[PDB]
Amino acid sequence: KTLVHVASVEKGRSYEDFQKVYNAIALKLREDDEYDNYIGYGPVLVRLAWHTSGTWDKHDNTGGSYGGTYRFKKEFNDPSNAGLQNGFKFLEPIHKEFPWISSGDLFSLGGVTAVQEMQGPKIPWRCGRVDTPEDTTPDNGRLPDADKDADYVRTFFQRLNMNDREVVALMGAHALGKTHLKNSGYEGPWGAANNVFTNEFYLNLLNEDWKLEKNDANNEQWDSKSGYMMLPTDYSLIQDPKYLSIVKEYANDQDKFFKDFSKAFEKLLENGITFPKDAPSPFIFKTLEEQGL
Ligand code: HEM
Q1: Fewest CB within 10 angstroms: 11, 189, 244, 263, which?
Q2: Going by C-beta distance under 8 Å and a sequence separation of 6 or more, which residues neighbour residue 135?
Q3: Where does the record place the site Transition state stabilizer?
Q4: Which domains does the chain have, with CATH numbers?
Q5: Exposure pattern of 9-40 as b/e (b: 16+ CB <10 Å)?
């Protein structure tokens, strides 16, 4: 039923070459700090890594991070991907300096570098995604809608082979960045610390006083008097009793949430890829701070 995508290391490259790419991304994150009203590019890079991987379908191995297909117009213009052009334009000069890295390796490594540089967990990362042609680009409509309930979320993520814990852990990336009305029809940040990776999304779900309101695009979202919001699908994590347990867990254990996020995010970025037996081990890149850079 299933196409095989075998990881193929970019020729002669090793951990040091990819740490250089990581560094170039991390230094540009630091440099281009004004983006999106001084949020910086971290959040949108995490989202680009996710949306370029989250097209995967476990049933037939279509979509997924391997082929780097977001570079093709059908996927770049998915209405679900509105806004990610900013992440892509950010990665352009990185790809020009390191033209030997594949597009899938760069889009996934952009997400890993962003989470780490924003003081999140270390995320092991494996190289070897290989660009595939335009006709392998998955159709629009594989990424999730925001107006739905917990049952939708649970069913949706079964296609990406994620269970409840992985779903709840991945959603904590909504600590980061904001919704922008012109992109998605929702507006506002989920919390205060939105370029530093913490478990604030679960603390705010449980602790803020949320009101169900309509925003200026006439879509419902949950809002707090702190100026934060939650999408219907975020709020569903405290409406469903199974998800709520795991929300309370991560609101109360930052290390657990980091460890679970790191595994789920690595899995998301690797779904669909076959690693040969003698492939290199996953790399754990040092942050700029760890290197004194
Ligand atoms: C039910 C699943 C999800 C839904 C419906 C959803 C929906 C959305 C929406 C509507 C936005 C705002 C886009 C904009 O207006 O710019 C957004 C932003 C964001 N999403 Fe999600 N999301 C989901 C899951 C995830 C996951 C799994 C991750 C990564 C692990 C993620 C990471 C992010 C990040 C980092 C942003 C902020 C982007 C920025 O600030 O530019 N999301 N999401």
Answers
A1: 11
A2: none
A3: 47
A4: 1-143+265-293 (1.10.520.10), 144-264 (1.10.420.10)
A5: bbeebeeebbbebbbbbbebbeeeeebbeebb
